[PDB]
Design a binder for this molecule. Sequence first.
Ligand SMILES: *[B]([O])([O])[C]([C][C]([C])[C])[N]C(=O)[C]([C]C1=[C][C]=[C][C]=[C]1)[N]C(=O)C1=[C]N=[C][C]=N1
Ligand SMILES: *[B]([O])([O])[C]([C][C]([C])[C])[N]C(=O)[C]([C]C1=[C][C]=[C][C]=[C]1)[N]C(=O)C1=[C]N=[C][C]=N1
Ligand SMILES: *[B]([O])([O])[C]([C][C]([C])[C])[N]C(=O)[C]([C]C1=[C][C]=[C][C]=[C]1)[N]C(=O)C1=[C]N=[C][C]=N1
Ligand SMILES: *[B]([O])([O])[C]([C][C]([C])[C])[N]C(=O)[C]([C]C1=[C][C]=[C][C]=[C]1)[N]C(=O)C1=[C]N=[C][C]=N1
Ligand SMILES: *[B]([O])([O])[C]([C][C]([C])[C])[N]C(=O)[C]([C]C1=[C][C]=[C][C]=[C]1)[N]C(=O)C1=[C]N=[C][C]=N1
Ligand SMILES: *[B]([O])([O])[C]([C][C]([C])[C])[N]C(=O)[C]([C]C1=[C][C]=[C][C]=[C]1)[N]C(=O)C1=[C]N=[C][C]=N1
Ligand SMILES: *[B]([O])([O])[C]([C][C]([C])[C])[N]C(=O)[C]([C]C1=[C][C]=[C][C]=[C]1)[N]C(=O)C1=[C]N=[C][C]=N1
Ligand SMILES: *[B]([O])([O])[C]([C][C]([C])[C])[N]C(=O)[C]([C]C1=[C][C]=[C][C]=[C]1)[N]C(=O)C1=[C]N=[C][C]=N1
Ligand SMILES: *[B]([O])([O])[C]([C][C]([C])[C])[N]C(=O)[C]([C]C1=[C][C]=[C][C]=[C]1)[N]C(=O)C1=[C]N=[C][C]=N1
Lengths: 178, 182, 179, 180, 179, 180, 182, 181, 179
Amino acid sequence: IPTYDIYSRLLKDRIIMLGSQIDDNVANSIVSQLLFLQAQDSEKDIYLYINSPGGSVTAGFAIYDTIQHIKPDVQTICIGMAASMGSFLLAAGAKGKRFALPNAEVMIHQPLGGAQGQATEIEIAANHILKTREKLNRILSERTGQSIEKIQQDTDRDNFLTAAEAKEYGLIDEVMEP
Amino acid sequence: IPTVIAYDIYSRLLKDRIIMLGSQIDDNVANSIVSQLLFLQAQDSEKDIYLYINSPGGSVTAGFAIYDTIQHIKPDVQTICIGMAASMGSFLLAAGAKGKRFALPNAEVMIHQPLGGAQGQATEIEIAANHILKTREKLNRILSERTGQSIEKIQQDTDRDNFLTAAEAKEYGLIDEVMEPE
Amino acid sequence: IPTVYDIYSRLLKDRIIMLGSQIDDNVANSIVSQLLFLQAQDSEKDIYLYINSPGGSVTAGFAIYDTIQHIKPDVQTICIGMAASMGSFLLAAGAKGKRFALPNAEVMIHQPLGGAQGQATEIEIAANHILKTREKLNRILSERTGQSIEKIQQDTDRDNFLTAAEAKEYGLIDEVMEP
Amino acid sequence: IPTVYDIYSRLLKDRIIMLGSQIDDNVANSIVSQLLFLQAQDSEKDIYLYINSPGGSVTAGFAIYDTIQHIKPDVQTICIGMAASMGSFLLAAGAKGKRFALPNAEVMIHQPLGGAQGQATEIEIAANHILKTREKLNRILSERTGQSIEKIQQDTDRDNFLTAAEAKEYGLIDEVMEPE
Amino acid sequence: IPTVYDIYSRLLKDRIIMLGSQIDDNVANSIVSQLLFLQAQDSEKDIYLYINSPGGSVTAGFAIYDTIQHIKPDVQTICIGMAASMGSFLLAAGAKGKRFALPNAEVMIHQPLGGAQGQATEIEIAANHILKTREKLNRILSERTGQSIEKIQQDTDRDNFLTAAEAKEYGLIDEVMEP
Amino acid sequence: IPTVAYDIYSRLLKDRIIMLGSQIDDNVANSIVSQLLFLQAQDSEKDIYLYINSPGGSVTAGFAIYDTIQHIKPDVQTICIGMAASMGSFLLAAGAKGKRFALPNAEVMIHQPLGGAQGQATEIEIAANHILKTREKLNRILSERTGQSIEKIQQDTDRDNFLTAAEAKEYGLIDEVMEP
Amino acid sequence: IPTVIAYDIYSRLLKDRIIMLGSQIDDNVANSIVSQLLFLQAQDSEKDIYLYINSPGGSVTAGFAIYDTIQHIKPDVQTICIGMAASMGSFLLAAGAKGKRFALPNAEVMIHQPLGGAQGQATEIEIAANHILKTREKLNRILSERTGQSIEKIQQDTDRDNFLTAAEAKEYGLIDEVMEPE
Amino acid sequence: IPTVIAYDIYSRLLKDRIIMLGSQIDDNVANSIVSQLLFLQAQDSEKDIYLYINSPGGSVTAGFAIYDTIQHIKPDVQTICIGMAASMGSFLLAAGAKGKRFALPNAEVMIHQPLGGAQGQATEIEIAANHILKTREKLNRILSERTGQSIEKIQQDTDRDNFLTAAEAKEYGLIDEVMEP
Amino acid sequence: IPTVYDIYSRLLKDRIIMLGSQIDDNVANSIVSQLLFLQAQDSEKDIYLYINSPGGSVTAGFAIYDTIQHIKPDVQTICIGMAASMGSFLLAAGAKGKRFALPNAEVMIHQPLGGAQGQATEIEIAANHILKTREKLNRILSERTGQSIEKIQQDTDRDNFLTAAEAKEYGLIDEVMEP
Ligand SMILES: *[B]([O])([O])[C]([C][C]([C])[C])[N]C(=O)[C]([C]C1=[C][C]=[C][C]=[C]1)[N]C(=O)C1=[C]N=[C][C]=N1
Ligand SMILES: *[B]([O])([O])[C]([C][C]([C])[C])[N]C(=O)[C]([C]C1=[C][C]=[C][C]=[C]1)[N]C(=O)C1=[C]N=[C][C]=N1
Ligand SMILES: *[B]([O])([O])[C]([C][C]([C])[C])[N]C(=O)[C]([C]C1=[C][C]=[C][C]=[C]1)[N]C(=O)C1=[C]N=[C][C]=N1
Ligand SMILES: *[B]([O])([O])[C]([C][C]([C])[C])[N]C(=O)[C]([C]C1=[C][C]=[C][C]=[C]1)[N]C(=O)C1=[C]N=[C][C]=N1
Ligand SMILES: *[B]([O])([O])[C]([C][C]([C])[C])[N]C(=O)[C]([C]C1=[C][C]=[C][C]=[C]1)[N]C(=O)C1=[C]N=[C][C]=N1
Ligand SMILES: *[B]([O])([O])[C]([C][C]([C])[C])[N]C(=O)[C]([C]C1=[C][C]=[C][C]=[C]1)[N]C(=O)C1=[C]N=[C][C]=N1
Ligand SMILES: *[B]([O])([O])[C]([C][C]([C])[C])[N]C(=O)[C]([C]C1=[C][C]=[C][C]=[C]1)[N]C(=O)C1=[C]N=[C][C]=N1
Ligand SMILES: *[B]([O])([O])[C]([C][C]([C])[C])[N]C(=O)[C]([C]C1=[C][C]=[C][C]=[C]1)[N]C(=O)C1=[C]N=[C][C]=N1
Ligand SMILES: *[B]([O])([O])[C]([C][C]([C])[C])[N]C(=O)[C]([C]C1=[C][C]=[C][C]=[C]1)[N]C(=O)C1=[C]N=[C][C]=N1
């Protein structure tokens, strides 16, 4: 905001700041930043700070798949709160390089959505959101080491975790101490 | 709206065992129709009742309050479609006493599958989808019994809005006769 | 609005029905109930249906139309002011020889209007339905006026305003009621 | 709103109809029904139509106009307050010799108003219709006032306010009713 | 709202009319109908018109004004609360000698208000009409109060509030009604 | 709306029939409670028939009805038509034992209470404790009325749970499916 | 949108012949994408262009502005689905250079039939219905050519919303490869 | 929105004599397109101009500001339909230099009669009706000149919305060539 | 909007001013500022004012009109699209011999529009003002076209649409610019 703006100045040092809800506009910007940083240097780590209430699942997967596709390691650092698709992206950082600050919060839960129309249309929408949850649970299981059954049970309702609990859960690797 | 020497016009027709269904079907309408049906049975459990239907449809459970009351009471309930019987309106038309389901010649009948909505967590959406799918299975089973068509044919024919003339509704089994002028 | 009965209830006692609004399911339900009541009171005496209406729902209009044709009494139709769209269709539906308009009353005919929203498949279903509805209206209007279906189709493509004398020449009414 | 009957129903018992609002289909249907009822009660006795109206729908006004001319009784018209637009047309439609205005009542005449939207072909249809409607109104008003159609056309091009005395000079009424 | 008849209908039985609202065409239609009804019942007995009104439409007020002057009975006018604008004009229109205000009633006089929109020619027509309406009001108020038209014009250029005693001095009423 | 002078519902009340056919709020409960009290005063022994087609509503309003049913001397039969959901299914289960019915295609739905809380953490805690105690109260009564364990009721009301009339009988929410 | 040593991030990617289509498709978006394609061809008529697609779809005519420009220009336009390619977005994904249409492993693809509206006289509704049906036939024919699926199968599979994984989109022929991590 | 170095993408294309119409046509759009056409004639009075058209149409008088400017200036203005050219958009497509009017293969063209509104006194509605009818006659006369169809055929073919494929638009005379790859 | 100058800034370098909107105070102050700037750059060279405008505020238009007459350079006016109301007034205000319209440009002339609300005295003031404003516009338009004031008054009573050829015949422009 102070004028580079401050975010452009941090991007020069390979730091991307996610500090909002995740929608297609945010995801397209984050993806473009990741591809640019890879083009600048395919070896150096990238740092993705996350303070986000979540957002669109498909927008989040644009970021997730780009993180996994590019050559650089992407460190993830939770400040404030990583909720919903934000906590999914926090867990998507390079293994060994996923962090939270000591008073940061992590929240996990199941996807939300809506369906309107004919019974046949509602069935299609329900099957899609159920398949999307299975996809999220399968990946979270791979990234945390927890069973798919445990992820399913633990996301049935809003589940708030301290930074220490998120490390225990396998969502992060370390609580970043001063 | 007008008054007869004092009854409003619908109260006057109710004295002759005629019930007019001429609106969307919601709980308020169903409560009134059920009450009229129970009242008419208490007055005379043998005489026929006449239910005129001009309705775009409405709530499935409100329609089933009327449907079940029709089947519970002793009097035959004749159904007469004027104008249009759509959605739950055509379901109630088909629910009239066998042999006593009618449509006037230019009345229209429309059948289709139920509509609804669901919002919230994936598990809540799944519960709502399962509920509306089961409701459709229930409606199709009854319509099959009342029309003679197979459940599979009902399912195919209600996937989208399906408009029938009075003559087509008779051929389908939704009514027994097209009422020709007296 | 005034009391004597309200004024419309007082006229109903003399077998007069006033259709003086847009035609919707509520209006059709009331008119059909009045027609059925009058037939039950006396199945031989004429009924008088005054029409001042901009039109309205086609299915609501057909509830009235089919009830007129079903009951035993002749239903005279009398246009005052304007009978447009489904209003002019009901005007033409009165007992043959007993369809009237006052000298400065206006009659308007046109094709049905509607809407469709959604998938291409759903728009196609809605279009086929409104087109079949137009064919149904045109066939009946042809029968009631003596005009060919082809002429009715041409003459309803756009709004077509008729004077009372032109409505008689067209076959929508039988007589212009003079003082 | 007072009860005696409400006050209007009580006056209707004495063959008086009160027009005190804009003229739309609901008002016209009521007035036509009152006129038909009064003729059925007695086809010989006069009816009195009081008019305080800003005007309204032309077709609704013609429902009233044609019913006045159709029925057997003379319909006296009495302007109180203001008879504007379709209201002044109905004032002039009273039985000749029995059209009145009170001394400070106002009369306004002007041409019809309307709207049109859509394709050029549709706008043309709507324009032709309102122009034919104006010709019809002007022709009848010429017959009822004795003024030429050309003068009626000129005098209604814009809002034209008349005193009661001016309305009598114009032929819209027959007499200014002075205090009894 | 209470019932005895509702309270106002009960007062009308004793020839009392209550004007307690803004004056519009609906109110004038009711007041005029009550005046005609009372004259038809008895053309000699006085009528009592209570006035608590902020004013309203000039033509609606003149419907009432001309009916008061037309009918045979004397119409006493009694201001309670406030008689403003067309309300004070109607107060002054009561039978001479029978116009009253209660001691703390307020009277306000001012010039007409209106609006005009459109072409210059239309604005000119509207301005001429409201100016001619103001001249008519001033001429009648001059006759009713005994004040010159020139004085009425000056005293109504802006809102002019009067006590009951001042209204009597002005000629708008004849007496302040004491207990 | 029709008249028999009685409206149709007043006419049914003469035969000890009460129709609950809307959402349950304080106004509806006030009306139902008053009808129950009136019927007891007319005849303290004869059965009352309460038809239920309701999506539910306020818990405290529902308990005004519930406690009145249990307080009065007459048995209250409950008859579900259409749908008895949420507090509606609670009241259906509250009818006199042996006299709780559903029509064959009527639906029953049970779930836990819903609410909201806003303000300071202390205020949110008070509101949360209140809705949890309210849920425990509902579940304890439903367990007594159905014969199901409290643990099963809690399990079966965690989310919306739709039951057919035959399933509602098997569950213990009603005693019989009313056949034609 | 951050700035780079001065470019905004998207202008910086355009320097390397990368176009980001990351919103609903309307005339404004199509004007921008078409102008970028024309500019890139003018810079170099031989080098590939990369079109990233994360779009819920949008206007069919706006999508065809982009589609026809992709086919008209000389460079191959690679298409890469990230996140979701739905409706006209999945149609443009399938429009990339054959062999150079990609989706990331967790990207979603959705296909369905066109949506629209019609209001007015019966003859106007008929004109609008005929137009949207002809538009659907055009989309299906091109999608058949681009995927290898029959027109009949496309019609069947787009009757309702049809969600596909990246792997299923490859089997369907909408893309050529699922891009696995580098 | 993207920048080329500094030009926005549309300014960079204008440097190569390309004008992009990609919106409804209102006075603001017409002011901009007229200004670009004047500027390009000032930069070079001989070289062709390329006007891409993807437009639902819009104001007739705004469209005529563009139309008259195309005919007035010395350079040939090529018109290229991408997406859709409807209503005044198809009128402008047909207004390009003869032999240099193009549509891409899946571009749509739609022709129809003008739309408008009128409110007020009968005399004002008559003035408004006469104006829109004269405007329709003007549009039909010019479209006849530019397509080679008779005025009577243009009138009949524009009574309702009339959608054409690119190939149908060429046969009609609205364009000269379907641009193939 | 096209930018490196925007396109309008580039045309201003060549002494071209583009009027392409309604005329309000913001537009007038921009146009006046451009005219004054151009005069300061070169007081001898012509200025070109393109006009496509539905009109607007009379006083804003007179800010432009008086500036055109005040500065030394000839201001050519060129109508493209439509010059209506104050737009056609400004079109007629260009240097004599240098007022143009393109062949399919339209010109519309009519009387001023406005509004007035409040006391009768206030409506009278507003009516007198718009009437004097119309007299001022007609007198200037008479001078710039050669038509009598009486003819201008008659021809602007309602909306009067003119082709470019008719506007030349009327005297609002000097030439229809052919290709
Ligand atoms: B969360 O709350 O951020 C969650 C992500 C996940 C890891 C549990 N996101 C969602 O549940 C979103 C909510 C949303 C709906 C609509 C617009 C934007 C965001 N859901 C989806 O993206 C969704 C919904 N239905 C089907 C598929 N995806
Ligand atoms: B119809 O359109 O009348 C139809 C009845 C038919 C298929 C026999 N009714 C419905 O589909 C209604 C629509 C509706 C929704 C919400 C409020 C009122 C009406 N559906 C339901 O009643 C419904 C929806 N979801 C689940 C169960 N029931
Ligand atoms: B008219 O204008 O009254 C006309 C009747 C005439 C052609 C004999 N009615 C309609 O066109 C109505 C308009 C309408 C739309 C929506 C609500 C109410 C009225 N159309 C229909 O009733 C209709 C019927 N079937 C299909 C589509 N529209
Ligand atoms: B007046 O102002 O009441 C006037 C009557 C006068 C000329 C004898 N009436 C109208 O101009 C009405 C206005 C109106 C429009 C819409 C709803 C209600 C009233 N005009 C018409 O009735 C009309 C308009 N266009 C065509 C035909 N009739
Ligand atoms: B007053 O404020 O009541 C006043 C009356 C008079 C005795 C000075 N009335 C008006 O000025 C009204 C205001 C108004 C009320 C309701 C509708 C419209 C206007 N003015 C008019 O009645 C009127 C009369 N002729 C022209 C314009 N306005
Ligand atoms: B149900 O949905 O009818 C249910 C009743 C129960 C037996 C499962 N009712 C509620 O959950 C209501 C919802 C409501 C909220 C606000 C106003 C009206 C109704 N809840 C309560 O009444 C409630 C909520 N919080 C605390 C106490 N009571
Ligand atoms: B999709 O949902 O994006 C779809 C494209 C197709 C490949 C399945 N687009 C549409 O269905 C659009 C929806 C829309 C409507 C209105 C404005 C913008 C977008 N339809 C159309 O573009 C359309 C509608 N009717 C006729 C022709 N084209
Ligand atoms: B079209 O749909 O773009 C069409 C152009 C023509 C070639 C058939 N445009 C119009 O019909 C416009 C529509 C419009 C109305 C109002 C504001 C903006 C656009 N009509 C006019 O420009 C018009 C309307 N009435 C009179 C004169 N011109
Ligand atoms: B026209 O429509 O541009 C016209 C000018 C013509 C007669 C040469 N202008 C006006 O009539 C404007 C309309 C307007 C009203 C309100 C805001 C903006 C524009 N009228 C006036 O500027 C005006 C001037 N004096 C008094 C009242 N109105």
